[PDB]
Amino acid sequence: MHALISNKRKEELDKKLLEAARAGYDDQVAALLAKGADVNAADDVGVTPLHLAAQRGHLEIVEVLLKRGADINAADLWGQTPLHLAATAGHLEIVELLLRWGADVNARDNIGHTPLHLAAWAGHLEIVEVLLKYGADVNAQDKFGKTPFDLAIDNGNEDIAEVLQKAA
Amino acid sequence: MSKGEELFTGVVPILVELDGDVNGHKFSVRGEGEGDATNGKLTLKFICTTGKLPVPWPTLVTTLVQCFSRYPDHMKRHDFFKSAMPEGYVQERTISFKDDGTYKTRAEVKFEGDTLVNRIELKGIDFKEDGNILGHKLEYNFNSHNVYITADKQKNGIKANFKIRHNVEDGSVQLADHYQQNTPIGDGPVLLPDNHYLSTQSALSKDPNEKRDHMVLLEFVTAAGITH
């Protein structure tokens, strides 16, 4: 039928968009977006093009996808948002862009980690400062009761621990 | 050594294949996911594909990849798993449950194609029929544990031992003592770590769109113990 053919072609377009976003082809991403691909498409595990673009550090693709209507607060099977992946990867510009566009700064994954938790765990000072600028909760606690200061102090991070101590 | 470290410099797909029999019952679980060795992140999903699993899911968490554990820059010399990866290693496990049956586990971890494959063989004996395990009396959660790794100096492997504490639905803790030993497969010099330990965190979830026996797992692992 025409309906089934339309659905199959749309699914092929969504798969092509996801592959292009993972690979980092901005031209193909824009071309597929113009042709009618779904910007909110997801895998079987719930991973969206914004997730891959933010995790792999494609700033231009992230900004292009934001202007089309990509949900900036979307969780996969493991409860991660694009801000979580961007903060744990260490991309400062994508984190800043997500925060400006209105990313939730106090979202929690399946373990209760916040973006500040992952920023302290990975060991990026600039991301910690940027997240604290926009109103991150220093005293957040995960399921096991650990705090972003504890994760910093027990992982060998020194300057991040000092900053978190100053922030109280 | 350095080649294994260079291998784990990004997101690596992970395939896990387990087949086993406990008290005669037969099952085989297939799992797929991704791992990030830079931060110790692991995101996996497991399916039973043979019906209903005869045992509670958490009991198989420790059996279902030590090479994706984060090691700080001052501990890079104590990374045995990455140093022996391109060919893989062999894990022998004895899981003695408290006042219940035991598990014997033989696994091989190899790097095939672009993916990392963990192949496991299980054998469970002496389990009761009204007990927590075979009676399905364990709840859906997982705690955090410390795994102590020491050297062997004779078999080019390492030794480990720890205790998993499960949670019964009646407010009780069941203690499963795990004994482990790792041996290399390929014939090449590998790093032999000093005595240290690994800290672990896990979170078990559920997929609302899967109509089978599934288990979603998110896991973080790090190394500690040594001061530099």
Residue numbers in the entry:
A (entry chain A): 155 to 322
B (entry chain B): 1 to 64, 68 to 231
Please give sentences taken from the publication describing this entry.
A potential workaround to the size limitation in cryo-EM is to bind a small protein of interest (the “cargo”) to a much larger carrier (the “scaffold”) in order to make it large enough to visualize readily. Analogous to antibodies, sequence variations in the nonconserved loop regions of a DARPin protein can be selected in the laboratory in order to obtain a variant that binds nearly any protein of interest. The rigidified scaffold described here provides a number of advantageous properties for cryo-EM structure determination—size, symmetry, and modular binding—making it suitable for future applications to many important systems.
Based on data processing of similar numbers of particle images from the five candidates, one design (designated RCG-10) appeared to offer the most rigid presentation of the bound GFP cargo protein. Following data processing from ~877,000 particles obtained from 3,575 cryo-EM movies, a 3-D density map was obtained in which the resolution of the central core of the scaffold was 2.7 Å, with a resolution of 3.1 Å for just the GFP component. The level of atomic detail is illustrated by the density for the GFP chromophore and side chains from the neighboring amino acid residues. In order to assess issues related to coordinate precision and potential perturbances caused by binding to the scaffold, we compared the bound protein structure to crystal structures of GFP in an unbound form. The binding of GFP to the DARPin did not lead to meaningful differences in the backbone, though a different rotamer is seen for a tyrosine residue (Tyr39). For the GFP cargo, the program built 220 of 231 residues correctly (95% success), including sidechains.
